[PDB]
Amino acid sequence: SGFRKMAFPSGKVEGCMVQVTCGTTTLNGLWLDDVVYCPRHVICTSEDMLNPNYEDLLIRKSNHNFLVQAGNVQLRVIGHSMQNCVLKLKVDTANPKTPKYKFVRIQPGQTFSVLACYNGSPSGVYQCAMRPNFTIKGSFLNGSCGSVGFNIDYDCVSFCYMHHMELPTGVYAGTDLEGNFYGPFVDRQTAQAAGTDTTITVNVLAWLYAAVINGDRWFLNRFTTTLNDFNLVAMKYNYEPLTQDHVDILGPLSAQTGIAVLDMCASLKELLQNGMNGRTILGSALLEDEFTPFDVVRQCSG
Amino acid sequence: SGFRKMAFPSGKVEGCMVQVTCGTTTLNGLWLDDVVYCPRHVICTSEDMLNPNYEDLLIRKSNHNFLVQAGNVQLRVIGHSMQNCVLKLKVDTANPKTPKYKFVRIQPGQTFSVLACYNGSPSGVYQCAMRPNFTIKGSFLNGSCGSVGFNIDYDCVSFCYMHHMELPTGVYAGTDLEGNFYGPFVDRQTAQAAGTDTTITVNVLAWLYAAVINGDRWFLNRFTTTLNDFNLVAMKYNYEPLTQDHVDILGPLSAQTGIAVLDMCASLKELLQNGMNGRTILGSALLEDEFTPFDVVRQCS
Numbered sequence: 346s347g348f349r350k351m352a353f354p355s356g357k358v359e360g361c362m363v364q365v366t367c368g369t370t371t372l373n374g375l376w377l378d379d380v381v382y383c384p385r386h387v388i389c390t391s392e393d394m395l396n397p398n399y400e401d402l403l404i405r406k407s408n409h410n411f412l413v414q415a416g417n418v419q420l421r422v423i424g425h426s427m428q429n430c431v432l433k434l435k436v437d438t439a440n441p442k443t444p445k446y447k448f449v450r451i452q453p454g455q456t457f458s459v460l461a462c463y464n465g466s467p468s469g470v471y472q473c474a475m476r477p478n479f480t481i482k483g484s485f486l487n488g489s490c491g492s493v494g495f496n497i498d499y500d501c502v503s504f505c506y507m508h509h510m511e512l513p514t515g516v517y518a519g520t521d522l523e524g525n526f527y528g529p530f531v532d533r534q535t536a537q538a539a540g541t542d543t544t545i546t547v548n549v550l551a552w553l554y555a556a557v558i559n560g561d562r563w564f565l566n567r568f569t570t571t572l573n574d575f576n577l578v579a580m581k582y583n584y585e586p587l588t589q590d591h592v593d594i595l596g597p598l599s600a601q602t603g604i605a606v607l608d609m610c611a612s613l614k615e616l617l618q619n620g621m622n623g624r625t626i627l628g629s630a631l632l633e634d635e636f637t638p639f640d641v642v643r644q645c646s647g
Numbered sequence: 648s649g650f651r652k653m654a655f656p657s658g659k660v661e662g663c664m665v666q667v668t669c670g671t672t673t674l675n676g677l678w679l680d681d682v683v684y685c686p687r688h689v690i691c692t693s694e695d696m697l698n699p700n701y702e703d704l705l706i707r708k709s710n711h712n713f714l715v716q717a718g719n720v721q722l723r724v725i726g727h728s729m730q731n732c733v734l735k736l737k738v739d740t741a742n743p744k745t746p747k748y749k750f751v752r753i754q755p756g757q758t759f760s761v762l763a764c765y766n767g768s769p770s771g772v773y774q775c776a777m778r779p780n781f782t783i784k785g786s787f788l789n790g791s792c793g794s795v796g797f798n799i800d801y802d803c804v805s806f807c808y809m810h811h812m813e814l815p816t817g818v819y820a821g822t823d824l825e826g827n828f829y830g831p832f833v834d835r836q837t838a839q840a841a842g843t844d845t846t847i848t849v850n851v852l853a854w855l856y857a858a859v860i861n862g863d864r865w866f867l868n869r870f871t872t873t874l875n876d877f878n879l880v881a882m883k884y885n886y887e888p889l890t891q892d893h894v895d896i897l898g899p900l901s902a903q904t905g906i907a908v909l910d911m912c913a914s915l916k917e918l919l920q921n922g923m924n925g926r927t928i929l930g931s932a933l934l935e936d937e938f939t940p941f942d943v944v945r946q947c948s
């Protein structure tokens with residue numbers, strides 16, 4: 346068996362998805378209390394998209410321009426307000442299904458679940474990671490914009506992503522729910538590129554810990570390296586630097602397996618230099634970097 | 648861009664999961680209308696597992712022996728029946744969150760989502776396939792039994808799997824929602840084992856057509872093949888025989904790309920010969936067999 350990518354159950358977020366229409370632009374909105382959050386580029390007409398001025402484009406629009414649909418119910422808009430790259434629409438009706446939630450901003454390497462929606466209607470959910478180059482590997486088609494990413498901790502939904510655009514190489518970019526982009530992108534029709542991605546070293550080590558715990562142990566060795574020595578080799582193969590923070594965060598998985606992080610690094614050094622040498626780890630021929638230490642401690646240990 | 652491993656939104660299933668307790672044994676149940684479906688082995692002690700006589704263990708139970716909990720609300724058992732390896736508990740309260748649903752028995756190679764649950768609490772959603780040896784790959788632990796697999800096509804929930812047990816290789820076995828096992832397995836702790844696992848050939852081809860529609864052609868070649876000559880090679884790599892049905896099934900992905908399915912088979916043959924040479928297809932450096940022809944058409948427009 347493969348140690349599978351697990352998404353959070355999505356039901357708490359499903360009850361929050363509405364359709365937002367502004368002329369001929371239709372995409373997804375997040376309905377929490379009496380406010381609908383959606384990408385501000387729903388106001389853009391197509392000619393505007395080239396070089397838009399959003400502040401003067403919003404003054405121009407008025408409440409009745411925004412058609413909001415929760416299933417077969419029309420929400421009446423009674424307010425609009427911009428916040429960075431998200432549009433907040435005040436509606437007449439609070440969402441009776443509003444879960445406990447906060448807005449958070451995740452760091453690169455951290456994972457979250459995405460609820461892909463089209464026309465305010467949820468389509469699918471999958472687990473992914475904020476890449477070091479602030480993009481996400483995924484699958485979004487036309488009408489996917491306004492789709493959100495989140496973590497669940499007890500009954501509390503942490504919303505961390507709103508989807509905005511596709512890049513070259515079929516990867517994706519969006520904002521937190523306060524409308525701030527992840528990575529050096531802007532909401533215009535313009536030539537934009539992710540630029541060189543790196544592997545998430547701390548996640549790879551976590552996934553080697555997950556492997557050891559599920560009995561896959563062939564890559565272990567007698568050697569231990571050091572941070573400076575490991576980072577020399579990491580830097581070479583396009584691997585995020587490993588910091589003393591990373592070592593500390595892996596501490597639990599270290600003590601639960603008797604494999605000191607710097608021993609496992611020696612293992613990883615040897616997999617980067619010599620390759621997989623014919624074998625697999627948890628059924629994968631590549632080193633997986635989209636499981637965090639927390640993910641591995643959750644799904645596995647617990 | 649877009650052809651990645653996606654589960655269905657789990658919300659319609661989350662509102663059905665409950666906890667079922669009999670003695671010291673607690674597992675998950677599925678609450679649709681006024682019935683709770685769960686694995687019948689809920690009525691077994693750690694001891695009865697080797698040779699349980701289910702009819703004998705069940706005749707000795709009363710409705711009040713079954714503690715069913717929908718979060719904090721205790722449901723009242725007012726009836727009980729056994730269908731194959733599933734226990735059906737009648738309760739006094741219909742589930743008001745019951746979606747539109749049906750029970751379906753799937754064929755090996757079919758995909759579905761699994762809502763993994765512990766103690767009636769959903770933990771996670773993941774997408775998988777009925778392997779050809781009628782097992783499932785993933786991660787269920789102590790607590791996961793009675794977790795269910797489903798598809799959601801246009802608001803109708805099709806329940807096709809309920810989790811029962813783990814087999815020595817760390818693969819998983821279970822039943823349809825009528826309590827009939829997928830495969831030749833029994834709800835019993837006797838050393839049984841899975842037939843050898845083969846690659847779902849029709850699914851890999853679907854995925855090669857997916858890579859082409861997404862604008863990736865590096866693996867294509869000038870050759871075609873006979874069906875018979877393709878299976879003679881593919882069996883040598885432990886690939887499932889391809890049938891006329893698989894070829895009929897792939898028709899629309901062929902027509903859409905103008906690559907005949909026997910020309911795609913020719914590519915796969917060479918992929919099997921050569922490996923990837925450090926290249927990747929839609930992001931993976933192994934051939935992906937848990938995406939069906941139907942899954943490809945749905946995630947393409």
Ligand SMILES: *[C@](O)(C(=O)NCc1ccccc1)[C@H](C[C@@H]1CCNC1=O)NC(=O)[C@H](CC1CC1)n1cccc(NC(=O)OC(C)(C)C)c1=O
Pocket residue numbers: 370371372386485486487488489490509510511512513514515517531532533534535
């Ligand atoms: C988003 O705006 C959206 O879904 N809008 C509604 C809609 C659009 C089109 C047709 C019907 C309905 C989309 C989502 C994109 C499109 C396909 N995959 C996605 O994830 N985002 C954009 O269209 C986005 C808007 C920009 C930020 C303001 N955009 C515009 C122009 C170009 C691109 N990218 C692009 O062309 O990507 C490559 C890979 C270069 C082809 C883009 O995402």
Ligand SMILES: *[C@](O)(C(=O)NCc1ccccc1)[C@H](C[C@@H]1CCNC1=O)NC(=O)[C@H](CC1CC1)n1cccc(NC(=O)OC(C)(C)C)c1=O
Pocket residue numbers: 673674688696787788789790791792793811812813814815816817819833834835836
């Ligand atoms: C299922 O009943 C369950 O979820 N257990 C409830 C529970 C236990 C402990 C505490 C709280 C709640 C389990 C699920 C299994 C076990 C671990 N992984 C799984 O997917 N089902 C069984 O344990 C099952 C019951 C048998 C069919 C009637 N069973 C019993 C005994 C042995 C095994 N298999 C086993 O030992 O697996 C190997 C791979 C050999 C370790 C088994 O599945």
Ligand SMILES: [Cl-]
Pocket residue numbers: 629630631931932933
């Ligand atoms: Cl892989």
